[PDB]
Write a protein that binds this DNA or RNA. Structure first.
Lengths: 114, 95, 87, 274, 64
RNA sequence: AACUUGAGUGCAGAAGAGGAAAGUGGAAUUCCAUGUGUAGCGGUGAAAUGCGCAGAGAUAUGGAGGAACACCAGUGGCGAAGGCGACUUUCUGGUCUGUAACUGACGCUGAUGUGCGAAAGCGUGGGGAUCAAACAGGAUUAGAUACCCUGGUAGUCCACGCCGUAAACGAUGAGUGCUAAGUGUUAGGGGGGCCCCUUAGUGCUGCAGCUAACGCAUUAAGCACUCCGCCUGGGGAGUA
């Protein structure tokens, strides 16, 4: 394409899955922190998210991407480093919307640890 | 004795000739079995806050009725459910 | 339960004198209509245990008012027991 | 409802029967009754083809309107009656100008209710109208499969299909088994579930009461001789000594799918069950 | 702070009055706590009812 | 025989997730079908089982089904208690305020009795998304039939019945009256947005007084009167 390809970032307490798709929800490329050789307790780190984002960002430029919408889904440590890893590659981040699903109840949350 | 306000939404793609055919008939049941409809207003094609059956807009009609039988409003909701033109309705007892 | 207009005809029917609302002939009669109304309601909504509890309090109030009336004068007790159908 | 007999006899301990309270007339009509001479499993040659079928109480056939096609003329329910040839009850209906015919009794059809066939009909219990005019989500019984043939699908006590959606010339319908399928839109149904919903909860009790509906005893194959059945033979009681339980005529019986392939209905079954 | 339902005298909050309701729905349609809006306890209840009626009739967004 | 203050009724008002039935919604989870998509996903303290390469995870659209109702939401409200939170309608219970129109003690408590009664459990018939006793593994340990992880059955949901137990607790029976205050909040009333007074709830400090102490203190565990239930060292034993 030319531009307007949204990027979905899944930052959790584990690896950060970063995927770059077009505006109509068609995946171009993707790169998680686990696909970069990162071991556990490395996967959920700001450093790993930095390479995780730009690794998929370079694959986007081959299709000619000049506009990204950052849709972040998850409460993970590697969120902000991921977004600054997209501007550092020159992807012209327009919007920062959080899409972490919030149930209006209606499901039994899995039991917590002990 | 009991006073009801009925608001229903008609789909925004209805044929204009069929719109008066539906609004006439549906305020028709609201005047049966002792019902004495007082107001019958049109609110126009407003923007819906969210998509309803893949619709972004819709016609709003508000009809206020008064009857001590309540079966006029139940007959409305029975037929409003069946009809594919009405996509949302609500009956409020006003006191 | 019974509407206010419905209650008034029961008041007028069994009132001892005019402007009487608290005699144990109108109170008993009003409760009898009220008791039958909740009884009819519970024929459909059988498990309305919370409403049924208020019915038992009404039955007790009428029963105590009937005991008081009998202990006062038996004639008015006999007239009230037959008009209302109470056994 | 179900009446539980008191254990006055052993052969009658856990017996149960239908209270027959929804029925209103206990006698048929001379003009809508034709003869049914029991055949008992025998064919055009005279040989037993289906088994476990034999003597039973006589029964008169009651002609039913499975193809509800009197369109426009209204009909009154005169009496809900008992039918011996089916699980559900039948209802006499008198049409607004003189003719009378039987139908299948829906769940809460009451005596004196009005029913209408046609295409301009309302969506109420009993009225029959084509599947192009039946809203998505309605319970329908007596569904046709072919335009004009007559209801075939969903006709036994407690049978109900749900119109679930559309395609082009076919409507999607979830039949009682759990199968979603498609039926041509020009075919008729009838709004509502079929009555005698408690027919499935009855207990028979007596051997003889099962031997009054025309059932005959069925012998377990594990006791016939080797020349009578695959499971037969053995000195003593024996397990099934084969890789799979088998059928009298030599064909696997616990799992083998026996639906002919290459049928002209395969393009119409979406998901299946049973 | 002042209620706006007692100050101006409103004794019946109407669910058709979307403009009046949009002052208490924040940025999501989320009902604003009465400490933030300063409406009394009596009017926080009938305002919540009006808002929920408007949401069902698509006069106010559930989420935004 | 007489009387209204007790108790009830009448009239004018008030608030409420009080109960039952039937409908209508939005978010989310799961599964299914496709489009894009490529080598991981997931999880831990580290793992691994596990799901993937037969295309998983992710992403977009659509569909099916079940369950619960974010924000409002609070020492907030209602109910005798258990308990009751999406919205609408229909039946229906209780409570509070004011008035003083009516009856003139019609009241309290209450053995036996008769009903209601969280979860779990049972029967019948449905339903089954999520979470899951038990069960399977994978780990940690010296061992781990446990905490951790991966799944997973009954159950969790509905309709009828049955069960009748909970740290069912304010660990505080019900009714009535009296006895310093201060300051809140909920629902009303009357006077001069503010102030004063007042009724009924719900809170926090705090006097007298009580207590072994902790503490309670006008919502007593203080001062009095009526009625019921219960206790008489710990085990054996809530067992015969």
């Amino acid at each position: 394409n030319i531009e307007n390809g949204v990027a979905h970032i899944r930052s959790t307490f584990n690896n950060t899955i970063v995927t770059i798709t077009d505006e109509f929800g068609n995946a171009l490329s993707w790169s998680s922190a686990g696909a970069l050789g990162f071991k556990g307790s490395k996967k959920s780190t700001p450093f790993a998210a930095q390479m995780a984002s730009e690794t998929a960002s370079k694959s986007a430029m081959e299709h000619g991407l000049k506009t990204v919408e950052v849709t972040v889904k998850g409460p993970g440590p590697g969120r902000e480093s991921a977004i600054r890893a997209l501007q550092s590659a020159g992807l012209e981040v327009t919007a920062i919307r959080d899409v972490t699903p919030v149930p209006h109840n209606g499901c039994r949350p899995p039991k917590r640890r002990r | 004795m009991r006073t009801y306000e009925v608001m229903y939404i008609v789909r925004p793609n209805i044929e204009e000739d069929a719109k008066k055919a539906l609004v006439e008939r549906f305020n028709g049941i609201l005047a049966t079995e002792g019902a004495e409809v007082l107001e019958a207003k049109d609110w126009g094609k407003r923007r819906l806050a969210y998509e309803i059956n893949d619709f972004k807009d819709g016609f709003y009609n508000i009809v206020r009725v008064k009857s001590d039988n309540n079966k006029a409003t139940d007959e409305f909701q029975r037929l409003a459910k069946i009809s594919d033109d009405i996509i949302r309705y609500m009956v409020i007892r006003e006191d | 339960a019974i509407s206010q207009e419905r209650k008034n005809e029961i008041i007028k029917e069994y009132r001892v004198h005019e402007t009487d609302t608290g005699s144990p002939e109108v109170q008993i009669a009003v409760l009898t209509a009220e008791i039958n109304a909740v009884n009819e309601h519970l024929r459909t909504h059988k498990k309305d245990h919370h409403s049924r509890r208020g019915l038992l309090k009404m039955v007790g109030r009428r029963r105590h008012l009937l005991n008081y009336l009998r202990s006062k004068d038996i004639q008015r007790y006999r007239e009230l027991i037959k008009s209302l159908g109470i056994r | 409802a179900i009446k539980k007999y008191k254990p006055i006899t052993n052969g009658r301990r856990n017996m149960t029967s239908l209270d027959f309270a929804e029925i209103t007339k206990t006698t048929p009509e001379k003009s809508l009754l034709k003869p049914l001479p029991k055949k008992a499993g025998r064919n055009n040659q005279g040989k037993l083809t289906v088994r476990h079928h034999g003597g039973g109480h006589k029964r008169q056939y009651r002609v039913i309107d499975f193809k509800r096609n009197k369109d426009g003329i209204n009909a009154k329910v005169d009496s809900i009656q008992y039918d011996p040839n089916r699980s559900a009850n039948i209802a006499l209906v008198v049409y607004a100008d003189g003719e009378k015919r039987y139908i299948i009794a829906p769940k809460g059809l009451e005596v004196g209710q009005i029913v209408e066939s046609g295409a301009e009909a309302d969506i109420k219990v009993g009225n029959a109208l084509p599947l192009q005019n039946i809203p998505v989500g309605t319970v329908v019984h007596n569904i046709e499969l072919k335009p004009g043939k007559g209801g075939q699908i969903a006709r036994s006590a407690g049978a109900s299909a749900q119109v679930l959606g559309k395609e082009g010339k076919y409507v999607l319908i979830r039949l009682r088994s759990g199968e979603v399928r498609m039926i041509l839109s020009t075919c008729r149904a009838t709004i509502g579930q079929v009555g005698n919903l408690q027919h499935e909860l009855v207990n028979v009790g007596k051997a003889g009461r099962s031997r009054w509906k025309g059932i005959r005893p069925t012998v377990r194959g594990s006791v016939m001789n080797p020349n009578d059945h695959p499971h037969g033979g053995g000195e003593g009681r024996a397990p099934i000594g084969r890789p799979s339980p088998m059928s009298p005529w030599g064909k696997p019986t616990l799992g083998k799918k026996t639906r002919r392939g290459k049928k002209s209905s395969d393009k119409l079954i979406v998901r299946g069950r049973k | 702070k002042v209620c706006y339902f007692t100050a101006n005298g409103i004794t019946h909050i109407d669910y058709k009055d979307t403009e009046l309701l949009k002052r208490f729905i924040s940025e999501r349609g989320k009902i604003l706590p009465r400490r933030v809006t300063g409406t009394s306890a009596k009017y926080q209840r009938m305002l919540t009812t009006a808002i929920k009626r408007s949401r069902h009739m698509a006069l106010l967004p559930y989420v935004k």
